[PDB]
Structure formats: structure tokens, C-alpha cells
Short mmCIF file of C-alpha atoms and ligand atoms in Angstrom, two decimals:
data_model
loop_
_atom_site.label_atom_id
_atom_site.label_comp_id
_atom_site.label_asym_id
_atom_site.label_seq_id
_atom_site.Cartn_x
_atom_site.Cartn_y
_atom_site.Cartn_z
CA UNK A 1 27.31 134.62 123.99
CA UNK A 2 23.63 133.56 121.53
CA UNK A 3 20.51 131.13 122.00
CA UNK A 4 17.10 130.67 121.08
CA UNK A 5 15.22 134.19 121.28
CA UNK A 6 12.86 132.44 123.42
CA UNK A 7 15.10 132.16 126.31
CA UNK A 8 14.42 134.87 129.11
CA UNK A 9 17.54 136.34 130.31
CA UNK A 10 17.53 135.89 134.61
CA UNK A 11 17.51 140.16 135.07
CA UNK A 12 13.59 140.28 133.69
CA UNK A 13 10.94 140.24 135.92
CA UNK A 14 11.04 136.06 135.62
CA UNK A 15 13.94 136.94 138.00
CA UNK A 16 12.01 138.27 140.39
CA UNK A 17 11.84 136.52 144.24
CA UNK A 18 14.68 134.34 142.59
CA UNK A 19 17.76 136.30 142.97
CA UNK A 20 19.54 134.23 145.15
CA UNK A 21 19.89 130.55 143.69
CA UNK A 22 20.31 132.69 140.33
CA UNK A 23 23.88 133.86 141.71
CA UNK A 24 24.16 129.64 142.73
CA UNK A 25 24.37 129.11 138.16
CA UNK A 26 28.17 128.71 137.25
CA UNK A 27 28.77 128.10 133.16
CA UNK A 28 31.97 126.04 132.71
CA UNK A 29 34.69 124.60 130.43
CA UNK A 30 36.47 121.75 129.72
CA UNK A 31 40.51 121.46 128.65
CA UNK A 32 39.55 125.03 127.31
CA UNK A 33 36.54 124.74 125.64
CA UNK A 34 32.82 125.81 126.81
CA UNK A 35 30.81 123.31 128.02
CA UNK A 36 28.18 123.43 130.42
CA UNK A 37 26.13 124.19 132.82
CA UNK A 38 26.86 123.76 137.72
CA UNK A 39 25.47 125.27 141.00
CA UNK A 40 26.69 125.41 144.16
CA UNK A 41 24.66 123.03 146.80
CA UNK A 42 24.63 124.29 150.30
CA UNK A 43 25.15 120.53 152.93
CA UNK A 44 24.07 119.87 156.54
CA UNK A 45 27.34 121.55 157.57
CA UNK A 46 26.34 124.92 156.39
CA UNK A 47 30.40 125.03 155.46
CA UNK A 48 30.53 126.87 151.80
CA UNK A 49 32.13 124.25 150.43
CA UNK A 50 32.88 125.20 147.51
CA UNK A 51 30.06 122.16 146.06
CA UNK A 52 29.31 121.85 142.45
CA UNK A 53 26.44 119.96 140.87
CA UNK A 54 27.16 118.87 137.36
CA UNK A 55 26.37 116.34 134.94
CA UNK A 56 27.68 113.50 133.66
CA UNK A 57 27.56 113.83 130.12
CA UNK A 58 29.60 116.22 129.99
CA UNK A 59 33.28 114.87 131.03
CA UNK A 60 34.07 116.33 133.91
CA UNK A 61 33.89 113.01 136.75
CA UNK A 62 37.82 111.90 135.80
CA UNK A 63 41.12 113.96 137.97
CA UNK A 64 42.15 115.20 134.48
CA UNK A 65 39.13 116.66 133.19
CA UNK A 66 38.11 117.97 136.67
CA UNK A 67 41.56 119.76 137.90
CA UNK A 68 41.15 121.47 133.87
CA UNK A 69 38.02 123.33 134.82
CA UNK A 70 37.32 127.43 134.40
CA UNK A 71 33.88 128.51 136.32
CA UNK A 72 32.23 132.34 134.97
CA UNK A 73 30.29 133.49 137.42
CA UNK A 74 28.17 136.09 137.00
CA UNK A 75 27.90 135.92 133.18
CA UNK A 76 24.50 137.44 131.83
CA UNK A 77 22.67 140.02 130.39
CA UNK A 78 22.92 142.86 131.92
CA UNK A 79 19.50 144.05 130.45
CA UNK A 80 16.35 142.23 129.97
CA UNK A 81 16.41 141.08 126.47
CA UNK A 82 12.19 140.78 125.56
CA UNK A 83 11.38 136.74 125.09
CA UNK A 84 10.44 135.87 121.16
CA UNK A 85 12.23 138.81 120.11
CA UNK A 86 15.43 138.74 117.72
CA UNK A 87 16.84 140.56 120.75
CA UNK A 88 16.87 137.79 122.46
CA UNK A 89 18.48 135.51 119.70
CA UNK A 90 21.42 138.20 119.18
CA UNK A 91 24.42 138.18 120.85
CA UNK A 92 24.23 139.17 124.65
CA UNK A 93 26.36 141.32 126.55
CA UNK A 94 27.75 138.89 129.89
CA UNK A 95 30.85 139.68 131.17
CA UNK A 96 33.20 136.71 131.58
CA UNK A 97 36.15 138.04 133.53
CA UNK A 98 34.52 136.47 136.96
CA UNK A 99 36.07 133.16 136.66
CA UNK A 100 38.21 130.49 139.16
CA UNK A 101 39.67 127.07 138.00
CA UNK A 102 40.28 123.58 139.09
CA UNK A 103 38.62 121.37 141.17
CA UNK A 104 38.56 117.57 142.36
CA UNK A 105 35.64 115.18 141.94
CA UNK A 106 34.07 114.24 144.87
CA UNK A 107 31.22 111.65 142.87
CA UNK A 108 29.53 110.93 139.05
CA UNK A 109 27.19 108.25 138.55
CA UNK A 110 25.74 107.67 135.38
CA UNK A 111 22.73 106.56 135.17
CA UNK A 112 21.16 109.65 137.00
CA UNK A 113 24.22 111.74 135.18
CA UNK A 114 25.28 113.83 137.64
CA UNK A 115 28.52 115.07 138.32
CA UNK A 116 29.30 116.59 142.71
CA UNK A 117 32.71 118.25 142.57
CA UNK A 118 34.25 120.27 145.18
CA UNK A 119 36.04 124.20 143.11
CA UNK A 120 39.67 124.23 144.41
CA UNK A 121 38.73 127.83 145.96
CA UNK A 122 37.27 128.80 148.67
CA UNK A 123 34.88 131.63 147.65
CA UNK A 124 35.63 135.01 146.18
CA UNK A 125 33.52 137.72 148.11
CA UNK A 126 33.71 139.64 145.25
CA UNK A 127 31.75 137.09 143.51
CA UNK A 128 28.09 137.13 145.61
CA UNK A 129 27.97 133.55 145.67
CA UNK A 130 24.98 131.54 146.92
CA UNK A 131 24.02 127.95 148.07
CA UNK A 132 21.66 126.77 146.88
CA UNK A 133 19.47 124.07 149.26
CA UNK A 134 17.92 120.93 147.93
CA UNK A 135 15.49 117.89 148.37
CA UNK A 136 15.41 114.64 147.92
CA UNK A 137 11.89 113.99 148.80
CA UNK A 138 10.34 111.12 146.86
CA UNK A 139 7.82 112.80 145.99
CA UNK A 140 6.47 115.56 142.21
CA UNK A 141 5.76 119.42 141.95
CA UNK A 142 3.34 121.16 140.76
CA UNK A 143 5.59 123.13 138.54
CA UNK A 144 9.60 124.46 138.61
CA UNK A 145 12.72 126.56 137.90
CA UNK A 146 15.13 125.90 135.40
CA UNK A 147 18.23 128.06 135.38
CA UNK A 148 20.83 127.66 133.24
CA UNK A 149 23.23 128.79 130.24
CA UNK A 150 22.20 127.78 126.79
CA UNK A 151 24.46 127.27 124.52
CA UNK A 152 27.01 127.84 127.35
CA UNK A 153 26.18 131.86 127.08
CA UNK A 154 24.64 134.12 128.96
CA UNK A 155 22.40 133.24 131.88
CA UNK A 156 18.63 132.45 131.22
CA UNK A 157 15.27 131.18 133.66
CA UNK A 158 13.05 129.08 132.38
CA UNK A 159 9.45 128.23 134.82
CA UNK A 160 7.39 125.36 134.38
CA UNK A 161 3.85 125.72 135.65
CA UNK A 162 3.06 122.18 134.71
CA UNK A 163 3.40 118.70 137.65
CA UNK A 164 6.01 116.68 136.97
CA UNK A 165 6.36 113.75 136.28
CA UNK A 166 8.41 110.37 136.74
CA UNK A 167 10.36 108.61 133.67
CA UNK A 168 13.61 107.20 132.73
CA UNK A 169 15.83 108.41 130.64
CA UNK A 170 14.61 108.64 126.86
CA UNK A 171 11.04 109.00 128.11
CA UNK A 172 9.81 105.21 128.89
CA UNK A 173 9.13 104.16 132.72
CA UNK A 174 10.80 104.24 135.14
CA UNK A 175 11.63 107.16 138.30
CA UNK A 176 15.38 108.16 137.49
CA UNK A 177 14.52 111.07 136.13
CA UNK A 178 12.10 114.16 136.24
CA UNK A 179 10.25 114.89 132.99
CA UNK A 180 9.95 118.59 132.91
CA UNK A 181 7.02 120.02 130.56
CA UNK A 182 7.90 123.98 129.84
CA UNK A 183 5.48 126.75 128.76
CA UNK A 184 4.55 126.90 125.08
CA UNK A 185 6.43 130.28 124.35
CA UNK A 186 8.76 129.41 127.17
CA UNK A 187 12.06 129.36 127.75
CA UNK A 188 13.66 125.90 127.19
CA UNK A 189 17.05 124.91 127.47
CA UNK A 190 19.76 123.81 125.11
CA UNK A 191 23.14 121.99 124.36
CA UNK A 192 25.19 123.21 126.06
CA UNK A 193 21.98 123.95 129.38
CA UNK A 194 23.29 120.19 130.84
CA UNK A 195 24.08 120.27 134.10
CA UNK A 196 22.29 123.20 134.57
CA UNK A 197 19.73 123.08 138.62
CA UNK A 198 16.17 122.29 138.30
CA UNK A 199 14.64 124.34 141.30
CA UNK A 200 11.12 122.90 143.38
CA UNK A 201 8.84 126.33 143.39
CA UNK A 202 10.54 126.34 146.82
CA UNK A 203 13.22 126.65 145.59
CA UNK A 204 15.17 124.08 145.85
CA UNK A 205 17.46 121.08 143.26
CA UNK A 206 15.87 118.45 142.82
CA UNK A 207 18.39 117.56 139.92
CA UNK A 208 20.39 118.28 137.07
CA UNK A 209 19.22 118.50 133.07
CA UNK A 210 20.33 115.78 131.69
CA UNK A 211 18.64 116.89 128.49
CA UNK A 212 16.23 116.44 125.93
CA UNK A 213 13.69 116.81 123.12
CA UNK A 214 13.38 120.57 123.90
CA UNK A 215 14.83 123.57 121.55
CA UNK A 216 12.56 126.93 120.76
CA UNK A 217 10.86 125.66 117.92
CA UNK A 218 9.59 122.92 120.14
CA UNK A 219 5.92 122.01 120.13
CA UNK A 220 3.15 120.11 122.21
CA UNK A 221 4.83 117.35 124.60
CA UNK A 222 8.20 117.25 123.09
CA UNK A 223 9.17 120.70 124.10
CA UNK A 224 10.58 118.86 127.61
CA UNK A 225 13.02 118.39 129.29
CA UNK A 226 14.52 115.12 131.58
CA UNK A 227 16.18 115.96 134.89
CA UNK A 228 18.30 113.08 136.68
CA UNK A 229 17.09 112.91 140.13
CA UNK A 230 18.83 113.68 143.62
CA UNK A 231 16.62 111.43 145.37
CA UNK A 232 18.07 108.74 142.78
CA UNK A 233 21.34 110.58 142.63
CA UNK A 234 21.25 110.06 146.79
CA UNK A 235 22.34 106.34 147.12
CA UNK A 236 23.00 105.70 143.45
CA UNK A 237 26.48 104.34 142.16
CA UNK A 238 26.39 102.18 146.60
CA UNK A 239 29.63 104.36 147.28
CA UNK A 240 30.31 107.62 148.53
CA UNK A 241 32.21 108.12 144.73
CA UNK A 242 28.85 107.34 142.74
CA UNK A 243 26.31 108.73 145.47
CA UNK A 244 25.59 112.57 147.35
CA UNK A 245 24.09 111.40 150.69
CA UNK A 246 27.87 111.44 152.48
CA UNK A 247 28.36 114.89 151.11
CA UNK A 248 25.20 116.58 151.23
CA UNK A 249 24.62 115.99 154.80
CA UNK A 250 28.09 114.87 156.34
CA UNK A 251 26.64 116.51 159.94
CA UNK A 252 24.25 112.99 159.89
CA UNK A 253 20.69 115.54 160.54
CA UNK A 254 19.47 112.59 158.63
CA UNK A 255 16.86 116.42 157.04
CA UNK A 256 15.16 115.20 153.48
CA UNK A 257 15.12 118.88 152.54
CA UNK A 258 17.23 122.19 153.51
CA UNK A 259 17.24 125.55 152.75
CA UNK A 260 20.35 127.57 150.93
CA UNK A 261 23.17 129.67 152.80
CA UNK A 262 23.93 132.61 150.58
CA UNK A 263 27.53 135.25 150.92
C1 TCK B 301 24.58 117.57 127.84
C2 TCK B 301 23.73 119.06 127.40
O1 TCK B 301 24.61 119.58 126.57
C3 TCK B 301 23.13 118.31 126.97
C4 TCK B 301 21.30 119.13 126.77
C5 TCK B 301 20.54 119.01 125.83
C6 TCK B 301 19.44 120.26 126.58
C7 TCK B 301 18.05 120.36 124.81
N1 TCK B 301 16.49 120.45 125.48
N2 TCK B 301 22.53 116.65 127.22
S1 TCK B 301 22.48 116.01 125.78
O2 TCK B 301 20.20 115.18 125.91
O3 TCK B 301 22.20 116.51 124.06
C8 TCK B 301 23.66 114.73 125.55
C9 TCK B 301 24.63 114.38 125.07
C10 TCK B 301 24.95 113.66 125.13
C11 TCK B 301 24.97 112.19 125.72
C12 TCK B 301 26.17 111.22 125.69
C13 TCK B 301 23.73 112.30 126.95
C14 TCK B 301 23.04 113.90 126.96
#
């Protein structure tokens, strides 16, 4: 696939120390066409349920569209293409042959733009999946890491080394979204990246991509994005079919954050 040359291949050195969470991310298609990004999250029962967090706006929040999903695992460039060079902006060599299809909707909520699906098939050992931890604490972070499929192309990593802030969708005063500032010549996010996770420096999911003004040519504060907060989604719409709590903490531990689980 093709995406902006400013993006960074997950196999590059920027992926060092994050080789676990990279494996939680997948790209997917909706009714046949490539649509967005999602990723696996762990839960307090440590049972490896196929809980796949994505964005509401991608439209998989219905029985009939969730059934239609095709997930592509390990879709990434084989070699590190130097960011900000023509090679990065070129067609990648990623394989889309490790797939699974079908899922059911656990919950969905427009305000924080999240959707929790459960994939029909159990983890295939051949895929070497990872179920990421999460953090629902009401706080900001000194930086963040994005792992996504820009333009639903080869998997990329974007680093933020600026503190996050709370905003409403659109950047106005609010607390439903986390505002993330990208590096001036670093990777960003693009259409297709929606529903991709944003992780704290400690590698726990804090939210998923709603959208924002960024592109590789964006400058200043326009080189940022907004993520619907796990904190918001936790209580969500007020019931199991619109929140994350029931699903992520079935064992009722009351945990504010949890680590990931390997295959
Ligand atoms: C849904 C997704 O692909 C994009 C991500 C864009 C990231 C750009 N830096 N979200 S969106 O913000 O394009 C968007 C599209 C439709 C709707 C209704 C909401 C937002």
C-alpha cells in the first residue's frame, strides 16, 4: 500500500522496545473494502478473548457490518524505509495473507468514538498476536506512541514526545479526547488510521484515533490528532452495549490499568 513518506515502518529502530504492542494491531476491511485500524486489548480475566478496539465512525458497530470484517495481521514493510524519503512514500511489500473474518459487536459509542468488537475466531498461534494493556486513569502523559495502518497500508509507528492534553472532538474545551502533538518531521496519522490505538510510554492503550488535522505536510499545532479516551469510554453511554468496563474488567478487580498478555 502507499501512505505519506513521513511515516515510519514498524521494523525501523523506532519500533525497538515496542515489538510486543506492534503485534496487537491489525488493519481491516468493511463489506469488502479496506477501511480502518483496530487492535487487541487484554482484560482482567487474562483469557485472550479477541476483544478488538476500533473507531465508531468506521461503522462496524452493527451486527451486520461487524459480521463483514476481514482482519489482516502482520501487514507491514519487510525492511525499514527511511522516513521523509521517496522510498517511504512508495508502494510497500507487505503481505495481506494472514487473515481472519467475522466478529460480533460488544459495544459502541459515538461521543468517544469507540467500538469494541469480539473476533469470531480464537487466536491462531501462527499469527503471534499480542493483547495490549490499558490505562483508564484520569490524567495526561508526557508522550505517547501510535501504531496504525495509514491509508490502510503497511503498519507504521508515530512517536509523540510532547505532553497530551484534554480536548473535545474538534479541539475545543472538553475531556472526551486526548490531544496528541506529533514531531515536526515525525510520523503522523491518515484516513484509514482511525481506530488505531494511542499508547502511554508504558505501552498501555489510552484511547483510539478519532481523527484530526495532521498530514505529513502539516505544520505547528495542525500536526496533531485526537483520540477518544478509554477514560471516557469506560462509563461510556451508560450501559454495557455502549461502554468498556463490563468487558475489560469481567473479574471485577477494579484495576485502573493492566499490562498486556502475549500469545
Ligand atoms: C476515520 C479515520 O480514518 C479518520 C482519521 C483521520 C486522521 C487524520 N490525521 N477520521 S476523520 O477524522 O477523517 C473522520 C471521518 C469521518 C467522521 C464522521 C469522523 C471523523
